[PDB]
UniProtKB/TrEMBL annotation, chain C:
Domain of life (superkingdom): Bacteria
Species this protein is from: Pseudomonas aeruginosa
Source lineage: Bacteria, Pseudomonadati, Pseudomonadota, Gammaproteobacteria, Pseudomonadales
Protein name: Cytochrome C5
Portion of the full sequence shown: 24 to 39 of 136
From TrEMBL, chain D:
Protein name: Cytochrome b/c1
Cofactor: heme c
Pfam families (UniProt xref): Cytochrom_C1
Organism from which the protein derives: Pseudomonas aeruginosa
Cofactor stoichiometry and binding remark: Binds 1 heme c group covalently per subunit.
Encoding gene per record: fbcH
Residues given in the record as heme c binding sites: 26, 29-30
A single MF term (Gene Ontology): metal ion binding
TrEMBL record, chain E:
Record: residues binding heme c: 27, 30-31
The name this protein goes by in its record: Cytochrome b/c1
Subcellular location: Membrane
Stored InterPro entries: Cyt_c-like_dom_sf (IPR036909), Cyt_c1 (IPR002326)
Pfam families, per the entry: Cytochrom_C1
The keyword Signal appears for this protein: yes
Cofactor note: Binds 1 heme c group covalently per subunit.
Cofactor(s) listed: heme c
TM region positions: 180-198
GO molecular-function term, one example from the UniProt record: electron transfer activity
GO cellular component, one term: membrane
Keywords: Heme, Iron, Membrane, Metal-binding, Signal, Transmembrane, Transmembrane helix
Entry keyword annotation includes Heme: yes
Automatic annotation (TrEMBL), chain F:
Pfam families in UniProt: Rieske, UCR_Fe-S_N
Chemical reaction(s) catalysed: a quinol + 2 Fe(III)-[cytochrome c](out) = a quinone + 2 Fe(II)-[cytochrome c](out) + 2 H(+)(out)
Gene3D superfamilies: Rieske [2Fe-2S] iron-sulphur domain (2.102.10.10), Single helix bin (1.20.5.510)
Protein name (database record): Ubiquinol-cytochrome c reductase iron-sulfur subunit
Amino acid sequence: MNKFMAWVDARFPATKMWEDHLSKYYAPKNFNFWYFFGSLALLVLVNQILTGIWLTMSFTPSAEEAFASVEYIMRDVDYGWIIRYMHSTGASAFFIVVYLHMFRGLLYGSYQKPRELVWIFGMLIYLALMAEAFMGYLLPWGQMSYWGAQVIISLFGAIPVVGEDLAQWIRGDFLISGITLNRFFALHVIALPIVLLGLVVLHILALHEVGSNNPDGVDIKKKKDENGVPLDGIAFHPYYTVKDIVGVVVFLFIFCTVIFFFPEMGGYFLEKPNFEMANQFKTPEHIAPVWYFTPFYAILRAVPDKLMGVVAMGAAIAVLFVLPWLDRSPVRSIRYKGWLSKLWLVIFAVSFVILGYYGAQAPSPLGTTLSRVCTVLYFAFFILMPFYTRMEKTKPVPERVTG
Amino acid sequence: MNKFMAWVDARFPATKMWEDHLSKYYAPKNFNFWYFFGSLALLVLVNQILTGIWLTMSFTPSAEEAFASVEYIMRDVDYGWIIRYMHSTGASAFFIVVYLHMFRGLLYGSYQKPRELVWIFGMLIYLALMAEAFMGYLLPWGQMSYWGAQVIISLFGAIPVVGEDLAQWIRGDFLISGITLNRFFALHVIALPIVLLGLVVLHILALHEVGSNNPDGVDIKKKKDENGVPLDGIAFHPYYTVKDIVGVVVFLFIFCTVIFFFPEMGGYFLEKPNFEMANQFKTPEHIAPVWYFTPFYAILRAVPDKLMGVVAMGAAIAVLFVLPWLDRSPVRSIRYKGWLSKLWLVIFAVSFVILGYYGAQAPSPLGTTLSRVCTVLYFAFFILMPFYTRMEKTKPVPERVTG
Amino acid sequence: AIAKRLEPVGKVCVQG
Amino acid sequence: QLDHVDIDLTDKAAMQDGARTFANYCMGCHSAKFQRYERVATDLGIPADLMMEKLVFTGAKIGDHMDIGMKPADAKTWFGAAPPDLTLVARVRGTDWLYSYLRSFYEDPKRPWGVNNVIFPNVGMPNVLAPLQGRQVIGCKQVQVVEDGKKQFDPLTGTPLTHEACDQLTVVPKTGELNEAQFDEKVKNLVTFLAYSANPNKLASERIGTYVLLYLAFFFVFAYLLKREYWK
Amino acid sequence: PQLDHVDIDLTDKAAMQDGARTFANYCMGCHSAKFQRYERVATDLGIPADLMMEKLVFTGAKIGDHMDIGMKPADAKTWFGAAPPDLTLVARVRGTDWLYSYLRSFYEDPKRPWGVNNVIFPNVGMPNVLAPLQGRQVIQLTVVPKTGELNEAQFDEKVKNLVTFLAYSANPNKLASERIGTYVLLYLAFFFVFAYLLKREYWK
Amino acid sequence: NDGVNAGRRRFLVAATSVVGAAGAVGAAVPFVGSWFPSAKAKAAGAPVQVNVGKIDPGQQIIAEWRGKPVFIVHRTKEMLDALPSLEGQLADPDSKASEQPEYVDPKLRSIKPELAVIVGICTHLGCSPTFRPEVAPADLGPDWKGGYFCPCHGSHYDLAGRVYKGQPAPLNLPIPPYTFDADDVITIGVDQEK
Ligand SMILES: COC1=C(OC)C(=O)C(C/C=C(\C)CC/C=C(\C)CC/C=C(\C)CC/C=C(\C)CC/C=C(\C)CC/C=C(\C)CC/C=C(/C)CC/C=C(\C)CC/C=C(\C)CCC=C(C)C)=C(C)C1=O
Ligand SMILES: COC1=C(OC)C(=O)C(C/C=C(\C)CC/C=C(\C)CC/C=C(\C)CC/C=C(\C)CC/C=C(\C)CC/C=C(\C)CC/C=C(/C)CC/C=C(\C)CC/C=C(\C)CCC=C(C)C)=C(C)C1=O
Ligand SMILES: COC[C@@H](CCO[C@H]1CC[C@@]2(C)C(=CC[C@H]3[C@@H]4C[C@@H]5O[C@]6(CC[C@@H](C)CO6)[C@@H](C)[C@@H]5[C@@]4(C)CC[C@@H]32)C1)CO[C@@H]1O[C@H](CO)[C@@H](O[C@H]2O[C@H](CO)[C@@H](O)[C@H](O)[C@H]2O)[C@H](O)[C@H]1O
Ligand code: HEC
Ligand code: HEC
Ligand code: HEM
Ligand code: HEM
Ligand code: HEM
Ligand code: HEM
Ligand code: FES
């Protein structure tokens, strides 16, 4: 209503925010498949929050009842199995969407100036997401849950001096137990969700401060019409809102297909050994991380030394933070970067996929050799970026976006 | 750093937000004792979130272990007793501070135009706080907890047709059980904390959009210096930040005194029968609400009919929502309102306190009569406001804040 | 049909 | 090497026979404690009174979980390994693994219980279905001849062409109630019931997902039209 | 009913030890203290762990175990008509004065199932388990002479020590709380002066 | 953009919004449905056999029936004579609007006068009232003749379970379906033979 909105606008900047962030907010008109994943990440975060709130209505964060409570959700709670599968598939889809989001950032140089803070907030979001998923995977209290938590927290025992004390303090016990379960449940259900929501708010605010990149890397703000609107810019609402609605429907089709027909996804979204209750005295023949942690695992497994392996695994994630300063290309988009940048992006993607694929299996000779090679390539993609971004010859970026 | 802040400001609205909300945001300079309580409410909300997160690391939301897990916090968890006392005394202090905040609003007409949205968001915050505190009080699973949950959920049973079905659906069971406990734990620990954070953000945003009232009710924006700064305005940072620091220290002194010397507060912060495990078959001989819920309970106890009592309680809270439109006074502050407004505000305060005092004890003849009289006075304060705010003669509001 | 399908394995011979 | 089994979760009779087998030969040591008798009866189409009379041996109620008297610690002490809860064993191991495991027990005097398992070597489980299967041994029997996947059947009779192999699971004749096919069907029904127990929402999941996907295709049509239009 | 005031001293280790002895011998038969551990009771009462295990742990439990008992609540509720509540928090549920008056107010009432009634807790389901010590108390309450091991003063001390242990059991953090609270309040008074001065400096 | 086709845009927006709202309702169905009583809640309860021969005069015992407390009170004579004297203070003296077995006395609300079996849950917001058999307590007034007093909002019932007038409780305390298996043994949960 006109009068109601006039009353609100005098007392709340509703119309002002709407015209500053969604309408009258002109994003590049050449977004492609790779720009669906921010909105899909928001959708998956909302799905995780809702389904987690509902699982918490029935979950028991105790070592004696966690697994039994999960089965109670799966069988006794009306549609509880739907909510649980939504949550597990939503964690896996959160990591799928976020990895594709980060790979878009890599492809189109979206981390470069002025979006360095956007990239840093996104990486903080990624760290929070990894912590959240790790602590959630302990909640079912299956064999995989318990033993993956055991190994991951023993990693903190690799710190030379304070490692063992730090690991014990994190566990809250001399081993992984119900104390660790309840603690990780509290962190996973409130603390990290709050941190993630705040980080997402900061991320979107920084983006809207500096504006979106585009597949061509063209700074659309340079060319503006008489009204001040970029020539290659269109209002986010309604054009990209409807585009993101279509993307959300497609994502929901895939998401519901997985939920209702293949919730386990061949044992990758719901690992088979995790359907057995945690046993402190019998460890699985082969213990592997959830798929979305597998690459870094491979890196850690590729290093013969324990402390060096932990340091390398941490650096594999920390280097993405400095990525904005590693890239010295005069152009943003891979479309106009030299052959070296394209080759190294291909190498990095292949190495990441191979690291994930070989970290999901028991160690093998070819697997170990390829994991070490891919660790070298993964770190070289970043370490050599400041050099091969300068050595290459880049194409001239068009004044107007293509399409 | 200058260079670091220049880098951030080109990528984040850091300095602009700081200078729009905290610095260069000119609040009236005549804030008194009654204006400490917004910052104190913020502090108590932060304390509740932090202490509740730490309690959730050791709480077991099951009927079998909730009471035992609370005692585990009190006895086995290092400093867990401190955290639990901070949490319970912080709930009590949250309602103390919020009630004083609402009474400041009543005194100085801070609900009046243009702050109707501020008041409505505050009332939504108060509803969320009532729900949050009620659901938290069920979690210990004491006798108080169980029987208060039983009564309050059966309130929905008063609805003539869908009442019983709605109450059963809210319970998740045919009686208050571990299902209700776990569901309320989920709502208390995530859903309502998120809703409260959002509502607090909206509340503060509305306040900053319309600006803060002052004890004199003087619209300081009318008179401005050549720089556009109100004559009676001072930057909120640093002056009111330091004033709020002093208020926070005083509040912390009282809060810690209660925590470490009087955590029960004579059985009003931690109720004595709630130290007994919940018994479905034994109802405590004195089943009374927490003190901050007593005034409304009294209202419900004062009405002989079940459904009318439930409606009267609902209407006791709902009437505060429409307060911005009940007050037709030409002046905001009680300092310049007529004798009728002052008398009726005194009547409302006395009636609220008397309802809370008699709602805190078992039914009595004088108690019942005074509850019934104060129930009619509480409602008359609102129902007669549109009349006695016009009948009364108001003093002229000064052009400058007095002090 | 279901009852025959669900007959317990252990058969006990009882006096009378 | 596992043996494939085509498990039909819509077969109520097979699931009923599997539930009977589980209640009689299996719940002595194994629990199904994440699963209630009431839900099992409802999903298998067993009347509640019939479920009470025929499958509930522990004095539990219809709505009670399929708990057993054997405690995990006691059974771990007695057998050397705790008999795991079997509600989700179909998801933990898969139906093919269970089908091959329950048919792969063979006499092995070197072992504590006189038996070993091809699928689960040195398993701590006694061969509790020996009365049905009969004595199974690692002996010499006729196996279909295969040469690089060149599998020979009899063109006329359609039965396999076989040669003797001396490291095969052979059931000693006239040692068990059921022949090879009958024990195969018994194990198939048992594994079908276990598959149902692990995933009791499978059929409802498929139905609900079909409807959800139909709705999402409809909504996609509308959203795609609202997008391509409004992008002109 | 009218209660008798008792001054409970939670720093009296000897009194709390005597109360713990009385609780373990006369009270843990039907009542659990399942929310506290033998180890913490020993630590707070100054009882060595070996001495605690030898003298106060009768159930075969470990020092770090909760003070559980064999009598299950359902069985006790059936037998007595009411379940003997866990007494770990009873000093907070009822207060030390109520406990002191209740444990001394048992008198003989043949109309009751256990032949006793209580002035503080009329028609209570508790048998008078301290009758051997107090003696035969009959109705104003008077103890029949030469019927109990202890006199009125000696029995009051026994009840006072027991109530003192119950008072400690309900609130094992009270002494540590008053110690920590003193320093927290001292710091906050120290911090207030700096905050107050800082505010005064800016508001000139 | 050249000549946007309105109506088509309006129709598509409206249709997409309606279909999305239907999908939102469907996606809400799991969350709303999970709040109905689960299989854990639906365990129900079996009838409870209570020996009532040991209840002393003017006393009451609690029986746990289907998760609820049942007051089984052995009523002495004096309170039975007093009960008819209270009919002027009771909203439903004849139990016309309350819930009780068809075979219990409309006024005494029990199979036999000397024993009353009452579902001990207050009919206003559902809490077990405190049993107050005393004649004239100071707190309950001089007109009291024994009965029940809800400690939540002070709901007076007489010893037959009948609610007094002007009370938060609108109905008499429910009488459970119970029988007398023996002169001193009742069963709560099974109706009595006709
Ligand atoms: C097989 O195996 C393996 C796998 O697995 C299967 C794997 O996957 C992997 C691969 C691993 C991965 C890639 C997974 C990665 C997963 C992770 C990153 C998970 C890591 C998560 C953890 C282990 C959690 C660790 C958590 C830590 C260390 C952080 C701890 C944080 C705390 C405890 C917080 C501290 C609390 C505080 C400070 C309280 C707040 C204090 C206050 C002051 C509050 C405010 C108080 C007041 C206001 C009062 C005082 C008043 C003041 C200040 C005065 C002034 C007043 C004012 C208010 C102004 C590997 C290698 C592996 O091999
Ligand atoms: C003596 O005793 C007494 C006391 O005590 C001791 C007392 O104190 C009192 C005094 C009483 C008081 C004063 C206490 C008062 C306290 C209270 C008010 C507490 C009351 C609290 C409750 C009982 C809780 C009640 C809760 C209710 C009824 C609300 C329930 C809410 C839900 C279940 C949530 C609903 C869930 C939904 C809808 C899920 C979200 C749905 C979606 C659609 C999610 C989104 C899905 C998608 C995106 C997928 C579909 C995709 C779409 C839409 C397509 C398009 C795509 C896009 C994304 C655009 C008294 C009287 C007393 O005498
Ligand atoms: C039956 O009246 C009760 C009192 C007088 C009753 O005063 C009234 C005082 C006012 C008040 C609080 C009352 C009702 C509705 C209240 C309003 C609803 C609306 O809501 C709001 C919000 C919602 C909006 C939609 C509308 O507006 C408001 C602005 C409005 C409102 C909140 C304002 C105030 C209203 C009670 C007289 O009590 C007698 O005394 C005994 C009572 O128990 C009964 O005696 C029997 O039972 C005894 C057991 O104790 C035995 O002692 C006896 O032996 C045995 O005979 C006897 O029957 C009974 O009459
Ligand atoms: C129906 C006759 C039965 C089926 C089907 C299964 N069991 Fe048992 N079982 C028993 C023990 C002591 C073990 C542990 C052995 C070890 O860990 O080495 C087992 C194990 C299994 C397994 C393996 C599950 C896994 O995740 O590895 C399956 C699939 C299994 N059992 C199915 C003991 C007993 C027992 C006591 C005499 C009985 C009657 C049964 N098992 C019956 C069945
Ligand atoms: C079995 C013979 C008992 C022994 C020995 C002791 N107690 Fe007891 N206690 C018992 C019962 C059956 C009950 C319930 C009575 C009822 O009508 O509800 C109780 C109760 C108490 C209480 C009341 C606590 C409360 O109401 O909140 C107290 C304070 C208590 N018991 C204390 C107590 C002490 C100090 C004992 C050792 C001296 C003791 N009890 C022994 C059963 C038995
Ligand atoms: C980024 C957001 C989140 C992610 C990535 C995430 C991830 C996960 C994962 C991977 C699991 C293991 C599921 C399984 O294998 O069974 C899990 C479990 C769980 N999560 Fe989270 N989660 C998120 C947010 C939340 C929130 C906000 C809540 C509650 C408010 C929550 C509550 C739970 C509960 C109760 C469980 C245990 C039940 C179960 O395992 O299904 N989660 N989570
Ligand atoms: C996990 C939850 C996340 C959410 C909800 C989220 C949300 C969004 C949204 C809505 C956008 C705008 C639309 C789009 O560009 O797709 C965006 C852009 C962006 N995101 Fe994310 N994001 C998340 C995580 C991340 C992570 C992990 C990274 C990188 C490490 C990242 C980096 C970026 C960058 C650089 C941009 C802007 C680049 C450009 O304009 O092309 N985000 N984010
Ligand atoms: C419970 C958490 C709450 C928080 C954290 C909060 C926060 C604040 C803050 C920081 C202020 C400005 C400083 C001050 O006035 O002290 C404020 C002002 C105000 N609040 Fe709230 N508030 C809360 C609840 C409420 C409630 C329950 C109401 C009313 C029902 C309310 C109504 C108002 C009004 C009317 C003002 C403007 C006062 C004026 O301008 O004089 N707030 N609030
Ligand atoms: C406005 C915010 C909140 C209020 C007013 C509030 C209020 C309460 C109250 C009154 C209790 C009863 C405590 C007792 O009687 O012992 C309670 C219990 C509890 N609360 Fe909250 N709460 C809030 C937020 C939270 C949050 C955000 C969490 C978790 C992140 C939380 C976790 C808990 C837990 C675990 C308990 C049970 C343990 C205990 O009773 O100490 N609370 N809450
Ligand atoms: S609970 Fe009985 S009057 Fe409210």
